[PDB]
Symmetry: D2
Subunit: 267 residues, 4 copies
């Protein structure tokens, strides 16, 4: 197994189409022992993660809750056993209020909404690293999820801004994590048909926003030299496991693109 013997925390499962669900499944297939964290609907999340190939302890973590973060390391150590540390951490968390995405005009998003989205989607990457680095082994790996924000696009709006912030946060987290012998990187994935994404294409955030996201998805597969299957998160999950493994040992502060090569092609 690629991750045999490694102890890895995976955040961000909410449904069986969550990117983090497939990260967790592939990691377990590769021998990793997992600790899961979930937000708000913990009964639902437990029922979802019962379908993973192996049982895993589930801990509550709202990344806006300073008490959850202050206790997180101790709860993880209780789950994996005293004297054991984590080898990996997966941040697979995002949120932006509806005013910050969709046909809702970019200029009409109130800052309270934008600030909440940047808190959950970018600042919390630093929050989780702060909480967990003291219980991570040298040679460890922190990985977060990205959507390439280097160019503007329709509908993503303030979530794009939050991803630009996250990429910057990742480069500073790498500075801190390096003191522990730990790497920090992001995986920039192409579009994946999660439940939230399927709802947006169906028009949950306005019709023309849904139309624009559908055109974005089509252009992605067209641009990708090896194609892009938005219905299959496994290539993204394998890329996250590659970063969690010992096989990218000199990469940190960086972004790995699991997007079919689409960002390397103009058309």
């Amino acid at each position: 197994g690629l991750l045999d013997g490694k102890r890895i925390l995976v955040s961000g499962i909410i449904t069986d189409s969550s990117i983090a669900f497939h990260i967790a499944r592939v990691a377990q297939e590769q021998g990793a022992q997992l600790v899961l964290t979930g937000f708000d609907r913990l009964r639902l999340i437990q029922r979802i993660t019962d379908r993973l190939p192996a049982k895993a302890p589930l801990l509550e973590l709202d990344v806006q809750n300073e008490e959850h973060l202050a206790s997180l390391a101790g709860r993880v150590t209780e789950a994996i056993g005293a004297g054991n540390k984590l080898d990996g951490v997966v941040h697979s968390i995002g949120f932006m209020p509806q005013t910050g995405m969709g046909i809702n005009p970019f200029f009409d998003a109130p800052y309270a909404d934008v600030s909440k989205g940047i808190h959950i989607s970018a600042y919390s990457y630093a929050s989780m690293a702060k909480a967990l680095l003291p219980i991570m082994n040298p040679g460890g790996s922190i990985v977060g999820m990205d959507f390439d924000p280097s160019r503007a696009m329709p509908a993503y709006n303030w979530m794009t801004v939050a991803k630009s912030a996250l990429e910057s946060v990742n480069r500073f987290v790498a500075r801190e994590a390096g003191k522990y012998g730990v790497r920090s990187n992001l995986v920039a994935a192409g579009p994946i048909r999660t439940l939230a994404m399927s709802a947006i294409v169906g028009g949950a955030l306005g019709e023309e926003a849904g139309a624009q996201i559908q055109l974005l998805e089509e252009g992605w597969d067209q641009r990708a030299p090896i194609g892009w299957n938005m219905k299959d998160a496994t290539p993204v999950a394998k890329t996250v496991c590659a970063l969690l493994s010992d096989w990218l040992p000199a990469t940190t502060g960086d972004i790995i693109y699991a997007d079919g090569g689409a960002h390397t092609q103009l058309l």
Copy 2:
């Protein structure tokens, strides 16, 4: 004059070493008629701007104040006369609480502090565009100030993250401004010895943070193929005026580097 007949709003003057003070001076030398905006210390700012080559109306603008922003367009129109519109807008505004910069550990900045810094330094670029685009002429220009955040560095810490967000905001503001025939761009300047910068090098944010910023400044002049004079903001001011003029008419959503060429050289 490069800006003869143009009506341009300039924010961000606080002392005579403010980058915006030199933007305003050069713009007036080139024939522009200015409206100035200032924050908090308006008595001080009026006394500072009395030294500009021409008189200019001074309006109060705290970019965190929704009432200031909601009234801004009407107060500008009163200042320049009904039936007149702006040709240019300069955003030269930044702030990050001390916990977000310096020797203060990156992980120890509370989100309330970071969110305030991102509000003032990044979100407000969209706020000012929202307020002022309805009173801007086609062919107009919005310019904001940037410090290249594409790589992490010592001490800049969460202000770097705010600049990463600002660059993303600029690309979305360009989308909105294009509907008005208006361009939006940032000038990424090299380090300039403002009062705040001089204080930081003197150790106001911790000794080793000051030591690191001094080493950053020295490397900048070394890297720049034409050199870099941190005591001279005029090259930055001229670059802002170039973007405010009609001579970069096909550039928008973009970043112009007024840094001596330092970002193009590794060493």
Copy 3:
């Protein structure tokens, strides 16, 4: 005039749709005194440049001819008068044999053809700087023409590779030019309907290559927040003059995008 009193060499005119023809016209409108260089068809080029607003001496320059390059500085000094130096140099030169572009498979371009294209399109930027820097004034400006090669695209093929090389060459030319007080930069233009470009869209390099270039042009105007008019080279010419002026005095080794903002937008 933006360029009043400046002495500027402009290469690359071959027809009245040449980007360099419009660079020269705008520069003369702004008070510059020009020296022109032309390749192979000097009778044709003289007849074309007779239509510029002012007379200008025309010198022969094949950038693959070491004798033309070794004599160029002396011929320029003869044209502008002893004791006079150049303030500006415009490189607006490109060529790639047909095997290196179009439907002709990327793998089938022989290296002899590719090497000729890289010689004319990239190496010659260093050749011209070597020849002309000894007769350039401090504060001078060298500008070359670019087409953004950061992503692959259909048909451009090995010309894309040549532009990637040119961007690298520009950063090294900036190092050398800085010793003379001279800046070096590229303007990355959007697509312009030159005679060669019109022929390619008409299918001169294969039908599907023409189809792909037409789709590229359409997407460009769609992406550009201020639009893009491929029939109008004046915005590109003005951007070149901006770099030749004193108004971007701290930019070197760099690329200015005169593309409507298209490269800042995904769709």
Copy 4:
């Protein structure tokens, strides 16, 4: 083994400090069956590769020799057996005449020398892909070696330009390779003390060029959040094997940085 059962061609071994020697060693440790290619000194190369953990057939390949390239696929098939195809190809080849590197002035490199360096270092990546893609399996991987050329630097000079060209070539090779189900990527490594590199630091290309390269190496380890050991090529070799494996299945046309994170940090 990470590469169990895979058949992989590895070019570029010349001494036991060659990056390709360590790529080959790690690949064999991970279960790959290798075919090696070598240039000019095949007796020497055979003696060097006798020290690899497993025997491997050695084929002659001068990438400037069209006859070597036209016969390469048939010689590989003979070596691995009819009906067998390659799963991986490693391009680890570079050369630039001395006039193109070191204290030798950038402007003094003759184009014949530069063209030879671009032939060997960049064009040959397309040449090898053209020769070998017809005998590669779907799911295969082509990997080449890069040194980040996005900024100019002392001494690397025209080799930097060749790497800029190589990055562009890689994006076009990805387009062709995708038709075969094959990925193409580069690994941008930090500095490694090969025999050639040790000689350059010792002054083989001029004293100040050696001084500048030594300062470059020191800054690299300083910048890298996890450090950088120029005496240890194993982290680079493991990264190449990661790309040769099935664990980065949605990455193509891309660059993976095995540099300690140095390129993500300003200082």
